[PDB]
Symmetry: D2
Subunit: 398 residues, 4 copies
């Protein structure tokens, strides 16, 4: 016995040869895409091969990659029937497509809508306008927070920022009662954690450090930059300057920080570009303890991915985050571009994008989707995996 | 094949009889106690079989076959380590370390002769462990606000109960307001909110009959372990409820009760509810019912709708520790509710419930030795609600093998 | 040479006989009524008696002639009194015809009345001045004045603050020192109600206030409407919340019967007045605590200062900041439609029209006090030397 | 009968000539100083007669007649005890007792964020020009926050009430919502808080550069002070450029909520604002500016009309409401006088229709007001019926220096 051989006739269907055309169709229906970084040496050893393969031919194509190839074919992934799962994701996408309401962030203008999924095991699925780039806006506030506590630790990062939400009373306060901004996912907090990344180095390269980091969160899928909104947020950041002058005056930055310099760095971070496919993977890195699901590299400390997931829950949808925490119970983060970065812990990462916002700042179709997501699957964080009434569980068989 | 015989050979050690005393000693090290309601038919058919032939007190596979035939689904999963904490007696030795951890924190002042302190656990499968002063009765005080919140949503549905009470915390600035921005109390775990949900249970009937309804409910949440009542603090808390009356009159003026509510009567019912007595063992089981989708773990009966036990666990997370709830939700992330008697009702979803009790409170109203305990609990096990079950650094996972 | 003789030829028109009827017409043009309380010995000793000579005259007015001199020497604080009333009539009628507003939940030729009584007793009314209505929280300064009159500034403010809330905070009960903000919001009024005459029963404290309001109005009309007493006992769920809140945060004097003080509070808010009556109470406040039509001392100078200071800052509920700016007069409104107005050192007034705006102020009342200071230099930070294009009725002209 | 002649015999004491030295000491005893701008033409014709015949310093009825012929309407009401404080030297000896009463109160610490023998001064100028100072009254110090009412007056004087309150409110904050910049109609609360003062700074004489409006404000302050000392201290101007991160924060917040007139350069307005905050005065100088506010906008020692009555009503009314930072509700109640303090140690005091004052001691309490200044203004209305809701008829055991 052993496993490169045993797996050969579970794909082979008893024949003595298998076309490679039925190996890839079998593998792409487990949810993996043939692009998968951890599948490289496997299909590196197959396009140089070219059409049926036999058990000698096969075995030294998959031997280095067969430990994970087995899980896809034994359906021991966290969503085993990933076919059933996507057709409900498509069904959720299409019911959100028909509620027109909202207006776009009027200082960035067929209109568009896309949602992408990437599981903690690398299973991938997109529908709609998934690789059209758009900026993160305040979607990036948890990522730069995660980076911060990854490099500095929980206690340093919260010497400078609090860890709770304000209250619908305090959408116009900057500081809490200990003279820290309330939390990392509101602008006053995001500016301060921007100040703590890679201190002592200049803003040209500490920006690059983040972009190195975002490249590791997306498994090196698309993370770009739009200079259009970088200058356009300097134009119309008179409020962000007030916060900076307020926090400078109230002694809230690490010592020797250049305040008006940090706010510039803040504006570039808010217009890093992604797509929903790219961003789904970074969401999935947060869903999986800080290990990127399509590369296997550990990107963020477990401490950082807990702290981040803890505050995207309470604070991630601006004033709608209390209603969110109640009715959907998933760590999520919205930004003004139309995106919502969604994390179902131990399952999946997601990015939904539709630019029309509501009257609180959340993608209108995005919010409808995440209600329907947890209306139908037991993904809320205070469901029980044993008794869950009339909703489905894609983590099990049929 | 068949499941009663193989279980014989899992315990029988190849020999052809088993002494009756070491079958239960095996089962008692699983974490279940021989008292388990779902084991009663098994031990009925075992100690009157103990005196059928009152010596030769060993069983053969036949006799065994129809002493465990009653509950052989649960008997196998106890002996095959398929409970959600399989090595339950390594786990307790860490619970014991955490008990003794907090035992040496002098601090606190009690709400107006040794140190009282106790913590009990009941897992989602019925496994139990207690340490310290676990069977001494004490009142729930605002520990009961989640339980009665669940009852409200169980009988009425989420959408009705929240026409009358909000679903978010106030803010650590507004710990002095009664109403939010929609003229509802902020949420079920503040007196103003709990008073209003008290008004929603069993409308149209008299207050004696709704009080019996709640306890009738609390008894099935606790698998019918101790649910009592202390009339001493009911009159002592009817004494000093001017603030709550202030809350009551404000809410009447702002039309915040259902139509036809007798407001001044509702407050008396509220003081009654706040001095229902429990122990750490009893409450331990109701926490575990919340830990288990609304099924009582030591009886198997359905107590609360999944809708209700989600809403409850979700607001015990946000709002459950008075002013310390954001700091709690961040550093331990477990649904909890403390009350002024010294209890903390703790839920690890899909694992266990707990009740820790030590009457000395800190300066926010939370049990001093309890808070120290629940920090170290998730400091030590990956039970935080946003840990990962795959990568979690130097922490232990009592849910798995080696 | 004595002053009854001196006053005699000033009236007599050179003749050596004077008709009695041209004397009262002369006296009514100074502003005083013939009913003036410190004028009665004069009008008693001529009502039993139609021309009179100098010995006839002398021994009817020696009685009161120190006060009669100033009416005829035009040394009253408003000397040309009918240029003055003639503008009050113009002010009264400009407010007439602004229909807007709605009445509270109390019980059809729609009513409006304003009366004035100067620091010298000169009086004038127009409209529905002799119809009774309740003070409501118009009474909050009067019971405050009583409290501080009997207890002193420092005791009374061990229990209540001395500033307005914030333009924001009419939905809080206490300030940051755990006192209600000030005596002219319900929470503050309840607690100063708690301080009147403590240790006695509530039937007797209510009589004590009524003894006192009888002295503030020179014994003019102060009655009571039990209809509105019952409606605030009925519809005071609000006030009970305040009482339990204040009882719970230790804000009453010791041995206070909380639920009893609130009933007493509801009684005080349903004391009836008219505009004429209340004009006098306003004028007592305008006059250093001396009732202008009796000469009796009613409130301590300390009390009438403290009171006048907070009707300025706090007297129109949420409109008191704008009020202090645009009219600058101590004033107090209540939900019945009244505004008790004080021009210090000049006059008191009471304006009453039941349609309110939606901050709680008589709509026609507020319009009137805008036009009043929009016309005379009665604002508290006008100058008595250069005052642009408006009137000063304190001089000749 | 002649209007110079009857006055001739009130001083001449029956004698037939008057020495120059007891006409002058008589006039100093009214409260006027002989420097008075509207009396200089009078002393022009006496300092020339002291040299025409070098000895025999005495005047005759005709010589006297046309030395005072010039200003005889004010000279008569000065010698006739027709000033609003007729016994001016009992009044000052009470001011001296109040000054000396406040001087032995140790408390306070100076704002030595911008720094031997304790400084303390108080000066008075009545609505009639009667003058009095004691202590450190001729030492320059900046207005700082004292200037917020004066430039507020200028704004509504040049623009009218409703325009100026198109951009700034007219009530106090409230001590719960005092750490906010805006109210509920998105205007700063009122002209006497930095947020409000910045906005009113933005409205003065727009369209011109900031140097020329600074010259305009100082032209204006000189006519409020009767052309006594109005200076500038560049040292604390630099100390306010360096410690203005809060004010820039205020500036950016207000720029984002559209709170300036259109075409305002916010960052320039902040610099103009810091300039205004370190205009220097002394207690004597500032005394006169207060007295202009006490007198319907007429400068009491020059007789010129400086501010519209509309402007000085509005100003006087908000110095009552808002002028003492967090202590203004307590102030308005216990002294009830329009006032403004600033962090330099000054309190600008107005008793309407009587006098203005400036008290200066740099040690502040823990709300920002002169310790010895506040002590002085309590004792002032403790002793005189100057509170704004006393009565001029019955006022218990208080003094009235306005009457005989
Ligand atoms: N939404 C709401 N509006 N108004 C409310 O009043 C409640 C009762 C009195 N309160 C206080 N008064 N004074 C203090 N120091 S707290 C505030 C809570 S809750
Ligand atoms: N209408 C409005 N007025 N003020 C607003 O917020 C401004 C900026 C931040 N502020 C804080 N003060 N104190 C804190 N801990 S944050 C208050 C000023 S909005």
């Amino acid at each position: 016995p052993s496993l490169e051989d045993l797996l050969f006739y579970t794909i082979a269907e008893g024949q003595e040869k298998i076309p490679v055309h039925k190996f890839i169709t079998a593998l792409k229906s487990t949810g993996l895409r043939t692009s998968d970084p951890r599948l490289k040496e496997c299909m590196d050893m197959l396009r140089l091969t070219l059409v049926m393969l036999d058990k000698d031919l096969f075995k030294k194509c998959v031997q280095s990659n067969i430990v994970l190839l087995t899980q896809a074919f034994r359906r021991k992934f966290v969503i085993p029937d990933f076919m059933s799962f996507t057709s409900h994701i498509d069904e959720l996408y299409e019911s959100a497509k028909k509620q027109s309401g909202g207006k776009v962030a009027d200082y960035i203008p067929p209109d568009l809508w896309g949602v992408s999924v990437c599981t903690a095991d690398g299973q991938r699925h997109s529908t709609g306008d998934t690789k059209v780039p758009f900026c993160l806006q305040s979607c990036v506030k948890p990522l730069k927070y995660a980076i911060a506590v990854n490099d500095l630790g929980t206690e340093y990062v919260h010497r400078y920022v609090g860890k709770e939400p304000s209250g619908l009373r305090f959408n116009k306060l900057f500081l809490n009662e200990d003279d820290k901004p309330h939390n990392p996912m509101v602008n006053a907090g995001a500016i301060v954690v921007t100040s703590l990344i890679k201190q002592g180095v200049n803003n040209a390269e500490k920006f690059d450090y983040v972009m190195q980091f975002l490249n590791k969160m997306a498994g090196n899928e698309y993370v770009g930059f739009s200079n259009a909104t970088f200058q356009s947020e300097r134009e119309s950041g008179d409020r962000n300057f007030a916060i900076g002058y307020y926090l400078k005056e109230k002694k809230c930055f690490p010592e020797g920080t250049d305040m008006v310099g940090i706010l510039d760095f803040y504006f570039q971070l808010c217009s890093i570009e992604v797509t929903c496919e790219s961003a789904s993977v970074m969401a999935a890195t947060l869903a999986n303890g800080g290990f990127c699901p399509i590369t296997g590299e550990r990107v963020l400390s477990p401490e950082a991915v807990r702290n981040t997931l803890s505050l995207m829950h309470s604070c991630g949808m601006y004033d709608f985050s209390g209603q969110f925490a109640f009715h959907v119970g998933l760590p999520a983060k919205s930004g003004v571009a139309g995106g919502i970065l969604l994390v179902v812990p131990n399952v999946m990462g997601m990015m939904c994008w539709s630019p029309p916002l509501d009257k609180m700042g959340n993608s209108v179709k995005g919010i409808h989707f995440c209600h329907d997501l947890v209306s139908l699957c037991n993904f809320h964080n205070y469901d029980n995996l044993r008794h869950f009434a009339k909703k489905l569980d894609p983590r099990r068989e049929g």
